[PDB]
Amino acid sequence: LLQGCLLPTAQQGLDQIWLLLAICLACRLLWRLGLPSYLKHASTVAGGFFSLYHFFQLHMVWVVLLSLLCYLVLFLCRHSSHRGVFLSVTILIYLLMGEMHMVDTVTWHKMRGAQMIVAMKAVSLGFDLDRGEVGTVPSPVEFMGYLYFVGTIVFGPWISFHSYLQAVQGRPLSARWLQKVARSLALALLCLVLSTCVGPYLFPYFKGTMVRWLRAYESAVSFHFSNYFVGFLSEATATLAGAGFTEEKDHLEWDLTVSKPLNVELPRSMVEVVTSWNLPMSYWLNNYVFKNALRLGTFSAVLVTYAASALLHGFSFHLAAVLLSLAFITYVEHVLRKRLARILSACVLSKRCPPDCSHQHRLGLGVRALNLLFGALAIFHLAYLGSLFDVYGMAYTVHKWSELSWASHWVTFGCWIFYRLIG
Ligand SMILES: [Zn+2]
Numbered sequence: 130l131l132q133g134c135l136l137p138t139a140q141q142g143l144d145q146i147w148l149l150l151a152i153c154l155a156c157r158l159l160w161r162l163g164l165p166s167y168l169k170h171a172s173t174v175a176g177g178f179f180s181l182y183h184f185f186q187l188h189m190v191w192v193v194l195l196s197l198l199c200y201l202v203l204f205l206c207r208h209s210s211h212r213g214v215f216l217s218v219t220i221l222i223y224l225l226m227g228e229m230h231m232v233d234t235v236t237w238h239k240m241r242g243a244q245m246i247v248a249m250k251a252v253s254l255g256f257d258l259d260r261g262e263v264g265t266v267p268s269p270v271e272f273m274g275y276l277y278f279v280g281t282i283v284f285g286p287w288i289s290f291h292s293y294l295q296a297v298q299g300r301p302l303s304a305r306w307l308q309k310v311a312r313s314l315a316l317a318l319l320c321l322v323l324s325t326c327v328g329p330y331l332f333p334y335f336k337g338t339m340v341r342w343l344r345a346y347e348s349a350v351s352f353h354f355s356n357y358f359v360g361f362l363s364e365a366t367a368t369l370a371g372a373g374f375t376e377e378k379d380h381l382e383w384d385l386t387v388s389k390p391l392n393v394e395l396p397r398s399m400v401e402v403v404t405s406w407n408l409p410m411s412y413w414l415n416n417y418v419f420k421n422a423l424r425l426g427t428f429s430a431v432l433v434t435y436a437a438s439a440l441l442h443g444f445s446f447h448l449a450a451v452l453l454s455l456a457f458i459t460y461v462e463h464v465l466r467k468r469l470a471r472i473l474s475a476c477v478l479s480k481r482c483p484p485d486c487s488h489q490h491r492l493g494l495g496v497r498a499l500n501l502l503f504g505a506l507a508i509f510h511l512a513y514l515g516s517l518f519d520v521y522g523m524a525y526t527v528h529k530w531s532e533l534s535w536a537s538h539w540v541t542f543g544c545w546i547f548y549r550l551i552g
Pocket residue numbers: 475476477482483486487488491
């Protein structure tokens with residue numbers, strides 16, 4: 130195992146990503162030299178081209194296409210107060226065309242992440258221009274540098290245009306920065322190693338229904354650690370490039386957090402799981418899709434947000450089914466937890482209550498028991514939904530979920546039934 134899984138996996142992951150980290154660090158050193166803004170943006174553009182070429186070979190043209198297309202659309206509507214609408218429509222078109230299989234499936238899937246981040250960045254800049262957070266429409270070099278920020282191009286977290294400009298302005302290289310990068314890299318490598326070695330072999334070492342749930346859980350936990358690897362790597366790359374900082378009370382804190390594994394592995398609620406899964410993505414979907422879809426109602430906005438999330442990850446039927454089930458699961462858990470908190474004056478909300486909340490029962494045994502029951506239900510939902518990601522169409526999804534006897538959906542139905550009845 131020591132030289133059988135750990136070392137090969139660590140080599141596999143650290144090997145390819147090394148170049149990306151190198152360019153992030155190079156960008157960071159180059160952006161502290163006091164170069165003009167134009168030069169900084171152009172430099173990161175060239176770095177983004179080289180990183181995209183390194184990860185996707187000649188097939189980087191699709192991302193290049195999207196980048197130019199989004200700028201073209203933004204430029205054509207540079208005076209319109211509905212820039213986010215036009216950019217979202219053009220992203221919709223491009224994504225749908227790609228999902229229509231016009232491009233090779235292997236090639237398309239290979240760069241779903243980079244294209245997702247570019248699309249999220251373009252839509253976010255359009256909506257920030259609409260709401261007035263960004264004063265003027267950016268120059269071509271600033272927009273292209275924002276899309277090709279080398280710390281946020283391949284697996285990078287979505288960052289706002291203002292966050293990108295703050296990264297451009299630069300910050301002094303400090304011990305705190307290096308500790309953040311090192312911690313993120315170590316956690317990324319650990320999560321990758323866990324995903325490949327610890328995760329898959331959890332229950333056999335570390336075909337009844339119990340066996341099926343064990344296999345489902347280990348496939349879910351392996352998928353989670355793979356996602357955590359991507360999240361921590363994204364934190365490492367973004368911090369190493371100079372972004373992801375919070376200038377709070379004239380005190381700089383490099384605290385960009387993409388994923389919170391402890392809040393998903395040990396979950397209080399499925400809402401917490403979804404939020405902690407990818408904080409940049411959750412924020413993006415919440416601010417640039419959910420708030421714009423509030424005119425359809427709250428539940429319809431939840432469905433629109435999850436459908437946009439399904440399109441951003443690429444339309445595969447298992448992931449679309451997972452996100453459609455997650456909308457109902459999170460909503461039902463949320464409402465039931467809320468109503469239980471109201472009726473039972475307890476701190477059993479989907480998030481932790483503040484220290485000044487009106488709930489009478491705050492630390493009792495019943496509150497801990499209810500939170501543990503909902504956390505076990507959340508782990509159960511995670512194993513159910515993550516069973517689809519073992520190492521895929523409608524038939525696979527149906528059969529695989531039938532192997533688990535549709536337990537989560539019945540449980541979701543029961544929670545929903547309970548919610549309506551008690552109120
Ligand atoms: Zn409370």
